[PDB]
């Protein structure tokens, strides 16, 4: 073994959640969104967006698009117009910068020197660049020349789960590796004008928000210096049956489009239980009401049907709803923010653990093809 | 440790190299390529491409962009025209299918049942899709539903090295995992008409070829059933000091563009030794001239200056030149093809090892930002 490996499970030694300073209220978001894209006269589709938005358990959204950014880059405000260049410039400058702010927060919470960073796992559903957002983050923080970078471009809404799994494997295979598990998401390539022909786009626009979640992932933290917040224990996927084009994401010239070929909320909601009913076996299979739910907030249909089909307490899935209301669906970063909010609720309410008292939890991510990216985490004591 | 833990270095249990049936001789490639894109009318640019081609050490190349494909799919024949959509429609089927035939060859050489596949690491600097080329490959071979897929998009010319490193960490962390290390590269999004402004485009067109390399990567091979060909021993990456926009890959609406700011062959060639000197230590320095060279064939400038600076025998770096002549530069798949050709040369002349007698070798990959993806391999005997 030329390169020594770790001897412990991957742990989250620091959570850094960075959002753009601009904030939007979902009470006023439909009007602003139908005004800024100059598509506010579609009264019936406007009312449909209203119904989705107030159905969506969303109150606030953080985006870098603001207003000055949106007018400075008008190509995003259009629908089905080739604009990947300007969106790509936006994500190239900002996704590394949002990731760097989140990484500075996660480092200050982590305490370790930036020179101790050796790995960067980076999932972005927004933009692509061969010079690298991972390399841009490595330069911005000035970690080290010897920085191994794994860049998982175009990961779906399970991108946060995929980053957690890949960073877990990276940290558990390299001794002393300090993986910067980054899931920075800036909804500039997915942002689009509302179109009735694409209702999944309407669901995304009512749900998608910007957010940078950075985890300092590593094994065997230094005692009294590095503290662990969550211990990743399991990771797996499953292409659930009847998953044929349910969610289809094509990064066209117009950006990233979640083309509507199926009822995404209903299909994902009815298919969630399948892999969940078996993914909890290695833990010891505790009660379903003895586990917190770091579920990706993919829309209130998912939470409602998961609650109905597993008969969970209303407070069990409250952290996902809280992140949905405060930030929305931030794609890969959404589930990382859900975990951070679960820890915040635990410390605010004085919970026994960082998972609102539950020793284990589901780091659920779902995306195109109904891959059920599921990680089981152990919350650190509070 | 809920998910069991592997033991032993990642090994290449089967090499599957699939190329499309079409062939294009580099002796006749410049005329064909300047005719198909309606660019054969020029004189100076045409002569410059001629000089680059006959200095490129290339004889023939395999491309899925045949006559029929190129005519039936225009837009790829143009320069600076938005065409990522139909290039994407090409590579969402052909990259998975080329990977599938390469994986069938790698499985037949591997012998193990397809249902034993659990992981898919996939590098493709050619195209992007959220449903997933990894998922498409998983369906095409009919693997298990519990297939964990790591998809690294737009890695670059070091994509094969990145796949080797990531699949090494995946196979060395999951017990019994059979990672399909895929580096399928169909030069459809990077195919471009010649242009005077993009002089790096000339180098790419003269060098870029289409090919798929699939490695069945896993730890603990089954004796008398699974045979290992190469075992990965090291993996690293540094940003060399003079790396500032030398290679810049922007996947714009027109596809993947390698914009030039500095002399790429000269800079890469002058900078390789910087990390090559230190990447040797883990091995123990058998001898600078006692190591085979699975170098990515990024152009004869790189081979010439590396040979001159490190004082290498002519036969030491012959496999990379052979792959350059027979297939060109296939980005991520190029290094995998170089390793396969090194094995073929070793078995053809009866070499002691699968690395022309050398116990160790350099799996060299370089890309944008002058990241030097270096892996030290150990060739199997005979």
């Amino acid at each position: 073994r030329a390169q020594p490996r770790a001897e412990g499970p991957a742990c989250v030694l620091g959570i850094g959640t960075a959002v753009p300073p601009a904030e939007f209220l979902q009470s006023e978001y439909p009007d602003f969104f139908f005004n800024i894209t100059n598509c506010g006269e579609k009264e019936a589709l406007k009312a449909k967006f209203k119904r989705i938005c107030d159905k969506s358990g969303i109150r606030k959204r953080h985006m870098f698009l603001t207003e000055e950014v949106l007018k400075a880059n008008p190509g995003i405000c259009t629908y089905m117009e080739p604009s990947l260049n300007v969106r790509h410039d936006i994500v190239v400058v900002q996704v590394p910068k949002l990731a760097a702010e989140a990484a500075q927060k996660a480092i200050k919470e982590w305490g370790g020197r930036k020179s101790d960073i050796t790995h960067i796992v980076f999932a972005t559903t927004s933009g692509v660049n061969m010079p690298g957002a991972d390399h841009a983050l490595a330069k911005l923080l000035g970690l080290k020349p010897t920085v191994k970078r794994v860049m998982m471009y175009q990961t779906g809404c399970f991108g946060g789960a995929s980053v957690l799994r890949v960073a877990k494997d990276l940290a558990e295979n390299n001794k002393g590796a300090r993986v910067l598990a980054v899931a920075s998401e800036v909804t500039a390539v997915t942002y689009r004008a509302p179109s009735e022909n694409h209702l999944d786009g309407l669901v995304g626009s009512a749900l998608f928000g910007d957010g940078a979640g950075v985890y300092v992932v590593g094994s065997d933290p230094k005692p009294e210096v590095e503290k662990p917040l969550f211990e990743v224990h399991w990771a797996g996927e499953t292409i659930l049956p009847e998953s044929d084009g349910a969610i289809d994401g094509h990064l066209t010239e117009a950006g990233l489009i979640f083309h509507l070929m199926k009822d995404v909320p209903g299909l994902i909601s009815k298919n969630i239980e399948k892999f969940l009913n078996e993914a909890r076996k290695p833990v010891g299979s505790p009660a379903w009401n003895e586990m917190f739910w770091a579920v990706h907030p993919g829309g209130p249909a998912i939470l409602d049907q998961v609650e109905a089909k597993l008969k969970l307490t209303k407070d069990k899935m409250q952290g996902s709803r809280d992140i949905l209301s405060e930030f929305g669906n931030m794609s890969s970063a959404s589930v990382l923010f859900v975990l951070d909010q679960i820890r915040h609720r635990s410390v605010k309410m004085g919970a026994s653990t960082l998972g609102e008292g539950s020793e284990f939890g589901f780091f659920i991510g779902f995306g195109p093809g109904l891959t059920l990216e599921v990680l089981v985490l152990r919350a650190a004591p509070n």
Side-chain angles (χ1 to χ4, degrees), chain A residues 301-347:
Chain A
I302 291 98
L303 316 91
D304 294 328
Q305 323 219 18
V306 173
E307 203 94 314
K309 299 193 94 165
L310 264 165
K311 299 172 181 178
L312 307 145
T313 52
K314 167 63 215 81
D315 84 270
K316 230 43 185 162
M317 261 196 60
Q318 183 51 58
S320 304
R321 271 190 229 281
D322 265 6
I323 278 305
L324 190 63
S325 48
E326 281 329 292
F327 304 99
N329 185 6
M330 288 159 315
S331 267
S332 322
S334 208
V335 62
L336 273 68
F337 274 69
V338 169
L339 202 58
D340 189 48
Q341 175 64 223
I342 286 188
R343 177 200 55 168
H344 281 331
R345 287 164 48 80
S346 325
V347 304

Side-chain angles (χ1 to χ4, degrees), chain A residues 254-274:
Chain A
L256 172 58
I257 304 173
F258 295 70
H259 265 148
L260 177 63
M261 269 51 170
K262 239 156 165 189
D263 175 44
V264 164
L267 197 50
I268 279 68
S269 317
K270 294 174 193 308
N271 289 249
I272 281 309
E273 38 80 21
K274 306 187 181 183

Side-chain angles (χ1 to χ4, degrees), chain A residues 169-281:
Chain A
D169 269 344
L170 288 210
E172 279 177 41
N173 221 46
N174 308 288
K175 164 79 81 199
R178 273 309 159 270
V179 191
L180 283 184
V182 184
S184 179
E185 295 281 351
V186 172
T187 68
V189 316
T190 89
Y191 201 92
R192 220 159 283 96
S195 79
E196 70 283 354
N197 325 64
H198 182 204
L199 295 174
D200 289 345
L202 219 75
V203 177
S205 288
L207 255 77
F208 283 151
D210 302 16
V214 166
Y215 284 12
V216 179
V217 174
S219 320
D220 317 299
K222 207 188 169 198
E224 310 305 312
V225 162
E226 306 177 280
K227 92 310 199 183
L229 307 167
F230 294 98
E231 295 134 77
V232 174
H233 280 293
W234 195 82
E237 275 178 302
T238 280
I239 302 97
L240 319 156
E242 225 55 65
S243 321
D244 288 349
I247 331 172
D248 291 312
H250 326 131
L251 190 72
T252 86
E253 323 145 49
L256 172 58
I257 304 173
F258 295 70
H259 265 148
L260 177 63
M261 269 51 170
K262 239 156 165 189
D263 175 44
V264 164
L267 197 50
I268 279 68
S269 317
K270 294 174 193 308
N271 289 249
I272 281 309
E273 38 80 21
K274 306 187 181 183
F275 203 24
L276 295 202
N277 282 246
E278 280 304 303
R280 53 100 194 73
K281 174 72 70 62

Side-chain angles (χ1 to χ4, degrees), chain A residues 3 20 61-62 69 71 97 106 116 119 121 132 142 158 168 212 237 265 267-268 295 329 349 354 356-357 360:
Chain A
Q3 306 200 268
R61 221 108 59 86
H62 274 286
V69 182
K71 322 278 289 143
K97 186 150 296 314
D116 200 13
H119 273 98
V121 177
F158 63 92
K168 147 202 198 168
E237 275 178 302
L267 197 50
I268 279 68
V295 189
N329 185 6
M349 89 177 69
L354 291 191
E356 289 149 14
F360 289 102

Side-chain angles (χ1 to χ4, degrees), chain A residues 53-69:
Chain A
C53 269
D54 314 43
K55 201 134 305 176
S56 74
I58 295 195
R59 209 250 310 159
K60 198 189 78 227
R61 221 108 59 86
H62 274 286
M63 302 150 33
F64 177 76
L65 279 305
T66 83
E67 201 132 356
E68 191 85 3
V69 182

